[PDB]
Chains A and B, each alone.
Chain A
Amino acid sequence: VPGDAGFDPLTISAWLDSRWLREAEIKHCRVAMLAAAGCIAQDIFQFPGAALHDAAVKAGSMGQMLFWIGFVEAISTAATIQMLQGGRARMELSEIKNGRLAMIGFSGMVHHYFITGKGPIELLTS
């Protein structure tokens, strides 16, 4: 229901379950918002002692993170299967709109790094 603009040219809603689609969109929105905030913040400041994916995997940070995220996702998969079997509203609309916005902005930031090898905020400053 939140984030409804009646936008379905390809009419995907009819041929796939709405609960899975909306849950998938909200999960993508959350991941994107976190990633875009992380990309700007990380340029602002560095965590102590710490393309970046490669350094991280060599460091081993990604592998431990993958195990803990995977555990949350495995517990979550039971929940998503259960859903498939069977002013707060304004906050939901803000959550979906900001997430969609990040899903566009973050994609831009990563592709910007391909072209210029720069972080998004520094690129503008330089």
Chain B
Amino acid sequence: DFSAAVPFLKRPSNLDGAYIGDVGFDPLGFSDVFDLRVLREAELKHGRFAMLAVLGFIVQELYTFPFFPKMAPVDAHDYFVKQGGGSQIIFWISFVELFGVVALFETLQGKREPGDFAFDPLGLAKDEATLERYRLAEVKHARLAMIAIGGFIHQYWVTKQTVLEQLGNF
């Protein structure tokens, strides 16, 4: 047996296609050592944060609420840290994360999918087929966005240019 993504490497044996997005890529082998449900929830949580973050970086350059002073997004962090606005965001995120801990227990028991928080306000996913397309898409967008996050945070560090301005410039 060999992994589909990388031909020379072997199929991990816990990656059997059970979870969407499985291409057999697990060279280190963490899937064997640890429960995959934890890792899939972590992957979705990390990716969802990253997808939001890359959009947030771009949008903040495009438009900013007037009351707060306009700042570079990477360095905005420090101003919010002193102001107390950043603490407010952390507290609410932590409050939701508390419920996330209970949800993690639900996943371990088997009552919950790894990343399912039953969020369908706009009812975008009409049927199972469109949901399947969306879940594979969400995995890809999360993975790519995790790469993209730090893509221009690190670029900001080498070159002090807004990612939009940097993209146009040079």
Contacts and interface: CB of A to CB of B under 8 A. Distances in A.
Contacts of B29: 78
Nearest to B29: A78
- The dominant DSSP class at the B interface is loop
Interface residues of A, number: 6
A74 B27 CA distance: 9
B10 interface: yes
A82 interface: yes
B6 A82 contact: no
A56 B65 CA distance: 46
A1 B28 CA distance: 30
Contacts of A75: 6, 9, 27
Nearest to A74: B27
13 contacts: A74-B27, A75-B6, A75-B9, A75-B27, A76-B8, A78-B9, A78-B27, A78-B28, A78-B29, A79-B8, A79-B9, A82-B9, A82-B10
Interface of B: 6, 8-10, 27-29
